[PDB]
Amino acid sequence: PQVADLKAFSKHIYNAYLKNFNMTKKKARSILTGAPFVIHDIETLWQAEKGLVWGLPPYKEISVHVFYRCQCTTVETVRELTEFAKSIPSFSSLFLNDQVTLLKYGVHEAIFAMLASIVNKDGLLVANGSGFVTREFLRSLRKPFSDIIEPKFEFAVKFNALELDDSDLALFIAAIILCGDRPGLMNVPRVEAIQDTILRALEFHLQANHPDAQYLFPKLLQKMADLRQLVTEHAQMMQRIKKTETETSLHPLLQEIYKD
Numbered sequence: 072p073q074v075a076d077l078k079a080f081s082k083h084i085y086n087a088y089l090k091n092f093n094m095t096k097k098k099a100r101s102i103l104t105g106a107p108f109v110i111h112d113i114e115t116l117w118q119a120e121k122g123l124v125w126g127l128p129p130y131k132e133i134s135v136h137v138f139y140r141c142q143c144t145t146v147e148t149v150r151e152l153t154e155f156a157k158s159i160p161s162f163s164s165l166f167l168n169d170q171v172t173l174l175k176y177g178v179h180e181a182i183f184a185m186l187a188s189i190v191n192k193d194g195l196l197v198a199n200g201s202g203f204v205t206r207e208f209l210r211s212l213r214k215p216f217s218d219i220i221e222p223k224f225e226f227a228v229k230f231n232a233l234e235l236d237d238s239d240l241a242l243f244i245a246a247i248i249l250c251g252d253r254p255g256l257m258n259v260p261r262v263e264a265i266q267d268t269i270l271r272a273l274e275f276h277l278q279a280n281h282p283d284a285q286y287l288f289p290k291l292l293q294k295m296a297d298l299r300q301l302v303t304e305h306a307q308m309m310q311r312i313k314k315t316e317t318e319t320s321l322h323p324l325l326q327e328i329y330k331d
């Protein structure tokens with residue numbers, strides 16, 4: 072009945088996910104278990120840069136160059152998240168303006184959620200798996216660039232402890248985007264209703280895919296809550312970069328998200 076009709080709904084979201092995201096956690100963990108060129112310093116960064124692994128703003132500095140790469144990566148993940156969102160029927164039913172409102176306020180949360188998929192205790196994949204940047208190298212970046220990405224690792228390791236597969240993620244992400252709590256959201260009841268359908272689908276999907284997993288569901292709800300905080304602290308550091316990092320330019324689409 073309920074538990075039957077939702078299976079469908081869940082598989083459909085999983086297909087949108089497989090169809091749209093550049094990198095699946097399956098593909099990610101694989102590469103991270105088994106190779107990618109390791110970037111742990113300037114030498115290897117310049118190396119990776121040239122041809123080793125790899126249209127950015129004019130060079131300016133090491134730490135900033137990385138910041139720019141982060142931007143390029145984020146912009147690309149925002150494009151996927153958008154396509155993924157549109158691949159969910161109920162999401163497209165919404166007026167174009169509300170769709171943009173959900174993406175505007177939910178993508179970073181989604182992005183940091185998925186970041187966990189390509190991240191292990193020591194670093195993270197880059198360039199479609201082609202390379203691996205060390206966590207220690209990021210930490211060495213001149214501040215404030217060295218602070219921004221570190222909290223994400225902390226988040227990611229705990230998150231990865233839940234051992235979620237791509238099918239769980241598709242639903243988890245969907246839940247994040249379809250959140251009726253977003254500012255200026257127009258058809259709040261509609262969004263809320265879709266979110267609920269997603270959460271119920273998620274739970275049923277979890278007791279199936281993770282039989283013996285104790286408190287998985289409510290734990291995921293807390294993670295959503297955490298991502299909300301993670302993004303908030305991220306936005307704060309971002310305002311500090313816009314204030315003090317006068318020379319560092321910001322991608323237009325990213326400024327639109329961070330303006331209000």
Ligand SMILES: CCCCCCCN(CCc1ccc(O[C@@](C)(CC)C(=O)O)cc1)C(=O)Nc1ccc(F)cc1F
Nearest residue numbers: 110137140141142144145148182183185186197204325
């Ligand atoms: C050696 C090259 C190093 C490359 C490092 C790239 C690290 N980085 C960006 C994290 C980040 C950093 C800053 C960030 O801040 C900005 C301002 C900039 C994008 C934003 O909030 O939009 C947002 C997000 C990622 O790998 N991101 C990433 C990739 C796939 C995915 F599914 C989810 C992800 F978060």
Ligand SMILES: CCCCCCCO[C@@H]1O[C@H](CO)C(O)C(O)C1O
Nearest residue numbers: 153171174175324326327328330331
């Ligand atoms: C590509 C989908 C994700 C887009 C995220 C960025 C959206 O920015 C917002 O665009 C709205 C509609 O145009 C406004 O009117 C704003 O004021 C604004 O900041």
